Amino acid sequence: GSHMPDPAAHLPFFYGSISRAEAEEHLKLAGMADGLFLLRQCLRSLGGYVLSLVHDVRFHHFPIERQLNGTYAIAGGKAHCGPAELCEFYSRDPDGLPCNLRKPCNRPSGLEPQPGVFDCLRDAMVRDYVRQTWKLEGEALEQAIISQAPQVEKLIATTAHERMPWYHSSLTREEAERKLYSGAQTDGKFLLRPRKEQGTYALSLIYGKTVYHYLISQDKAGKYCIPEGTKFDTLWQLVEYLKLKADGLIYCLKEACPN
C-alpha cells in the first residue's frame, strides 16, 4: 500500500499534490474574492507546501519551505510549527502577503487530497526500514507503518549518512569505480561518497557494466540535490527517492554496494 497521507490531511482547504492549474481552477469556481485561499503540497520540496491565495482577482502562489527543524515558512517569512498554524497566522496578519487570509477554499464535497510522488517516497522508505529492521510483513507491516512512520521519519530524515551501508566515508573517483566494477556489476549497483568541496558528495552507480558519477550538492538551506534539482533533508531520503525516479540519472538506484 505505497503512498502515505500528508500531515495536513485534516485541513479542509488542503488539496494535496495538485498543479497550480487545478488549484487555480478550484479558486476560480469558488468566488475569486480577496482573501480566498487553499493549501497544496509543494511539487519540488519534500515536506513542502504552497499557499495559493486570491487578491484583486489575481492569483498568488507562495511556496512553503519545510525547514530542517520541522517548521514551515514562506521565503523570508516567519517560522510556524505546522501548516495549520501558518494559515491561522496569516488569517490574522498579512505580514507581507497581498492581504490576510479570509475564507478558505475548502475542497468541494466528496473530494480529498491527492498523493504525489513524495507520498510514495514516504511510504516506501518507512516500509523498507521496518520490513528490513523487524522483518514485519502483511497486515502486521501495514500497522507498524502507521505507528512507526512518525519515528521512521524522525530517524530517516535525521540519521547521519555515515551509518548508511551505501555510504563510503573515503573514496576517490577511481577508488569508487574499482569497487563497483568488482562485484555483480548489476544495473543500479551504487554507493555514495564525499567530495573535496564543502557540502558536496558524489553518487556513483553502474549501468551497462559502466560507471557513472553524479554530483550531489547542499544548498544554503542545508538540503541536498543532484542537477535535476529535487531537494532533500538527507542523502537517505535522496537515495530512497532516486530508487523511485531516475530524476536525471541514467538508471534508478537498486542494490547498495556494501560499506
Single out the residue of 75, 73, 27 nearest to residue 53, CA to CA.
27
Q: CA-to-CA distance for 7 and 22, rounded, in angstroms?
A: 21
| Assigned fold of 116-159 | Syk Kinase; Chain A, domain 2 (1.10.930)
Question: For the chain, what is the largest distance between any 2 Cα atoms, rounded to a whole number of angstroms?
Answer: 64
**Domain 12-115 is classified in which CATH homologous superfamily?**
SH2 domain (3.30.505.10)
Burial bucket for residue 141 (CB in 10 Å: 0-12, 13-18, 19+) = middle
CB-CB contact of 36 with 30 (8 Å): yes
**Set of cell numbers at residue 238:** 535522496
CB-CB contact of 242 with 249 (8 Å): yes
Domain extents for the chain? 12-115, 116-159, 160-256
- List CB contacts of 139: < 8 A, sequence separation 6 or more: none
Q: What's this structure's resolution in Å? A: 2.5
Burial bucket for residue 125 (CB in 10 Å: 0-12, 13-18, 19+) = buried
Q: What technique solved it?
A: X-ray
Single out the residue of 241, 22, 222, 228 nearest to residue 119, CA to CA.
241
CA distances from 102 to 39, 86, 87, 223 (A): 13, 14, 10, 33
**Set of cell numbers at residue 155:** 530517524
Q: Which CATH class is domain 160-256?
A: alpha beta
**Which residue shows C-alpha cell 543532484?**
226
Coil, helix or strand at residue 126: helix
Same CATH topology for 12-115 and 160-256: the answer is: yes
> N- to C-terminal Cα distance for the chain?
30
Beta strands across the sheet bearing 49-55? 14-16, 37-41, 49-55, 58-66, 72-74
Q: For the residues of 158-184, what is the DSSP string, one character each?
A: TS-GGGSTTB-SS--HHHHHHHHHTTT
Single out the residue of 244, 255, 46 nearest to residue 156, CA to CA.
46
Q: CA-to-CA distance for 118 and 102, rounded, in angstroms?
A: 29
State the helix-helix crossing angle for 138-156 and 235-242, rounded to 10 degrees. Answer: 140
- List CB contacts of 79: < 8 A, sequence separation 6 or more: 67, 71, 72, 73
